[PDB]
């Protein structure tokens, strides 16, 4: 680890600086270094970790989609053979994406999840595990594709079970988990009806619990509720 000589607190400070500078690869490297110090992460620190890698992998996914689209068109009837370059470069980006996903999954497995006992930490990490298996699933085509999908499903399901037992229905982690598990159903598991049911039930149960919240908690919860509605509108 090239961050092994830097203080944990300095890594966290520099992750925040990297965020301000929109240097998300640096942010992710700093937060990986912080995780590798071996201490549990606070709430703020968990969100720095997730923000960093979500931005990095989000850019990779967008690039992969562009290249996959070009590749599929190069393979339509009538196309002019362009050689191996489009496939090669899509493969390059894909391998880099898989590497980022494997890095995050490795941090969760060594040893963030096993030390996470509070619902807010454990659900957050299991959601991340489902998310990064989902990104692996998006590019998977081989003998392992079904197992990658089931790994995402299993992580999301454990997170869901804990969240329903231990968090209120407006908890933003619970809401974001359900949002993403619903997208997993729609886009990965070929289960649009499950996706729609989950989004609707999550939205309605949250609606009924909003009366318990402060103004600031209300803003946080209704933001994610709007994303659930947005997806439902896309899908119906």
């Amino acid at each position: 680890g090239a961050m092994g000589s830097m203080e944990r607190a300095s890594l966290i400070q520099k992750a925040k600086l990297a965020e301000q500078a929109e240097r998300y690869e640096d942010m992710a490297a700093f937060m990986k270094g912080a995780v590798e110090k071996g201490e549990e992460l606070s709430c703020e620190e968990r969100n720095l970790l997730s923000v960093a890698y979500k931005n990095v992998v989000g850019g990779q996914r967008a690039a992969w989609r562009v290249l996959s689209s070009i590749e599929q068109k190069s393979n339509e009837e009538g196309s002019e053979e362009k050689g191996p370059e489009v496939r090669e470069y899509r493969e390059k980006v894909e391998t880099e994406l898989q590497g980022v996903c494997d890095t995050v999954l490795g941090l969760l497995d060594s040893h963030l999840i096993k030390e996470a006992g509070d619902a807010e930490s454990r659900v957050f990490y299991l959601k991340m595990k489902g998310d990064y298996y989902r990104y692996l699933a998006e590019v998977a085509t081989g003998d392992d594709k079904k197992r990658i999908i089931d790994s995402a499903r299993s992580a999301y399901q454990e997170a869901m079970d804990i969240s329903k037992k231990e968090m209120p229905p407006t908890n933003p982690i619970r809401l974001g988990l359900a949002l993403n598990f619903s997208v997993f159903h729609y886009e990965i598991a070929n289960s649009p009806e499950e996706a729609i049911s989950l989004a609707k039930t999550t939205f309605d149960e949250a609606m009924a619990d909003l009366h318990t919240l402060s103004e600031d908690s209300y803003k946080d919860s209704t933001l994610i509720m709007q994303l659930l509605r947005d997806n439902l509108t896309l899908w119906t």
């Binding site: 998310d131 974001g176 949002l179 993403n180 997208v183 729609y186 886009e187 994610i224 994303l227 947005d230 997806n231 896309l234 899908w235």
Partner: peptide
């Protein structure tokens, strides 16, 4: 694409 967080 659908929304995720």
């Amino acid at each position: 694409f659908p929304a995720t967080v």
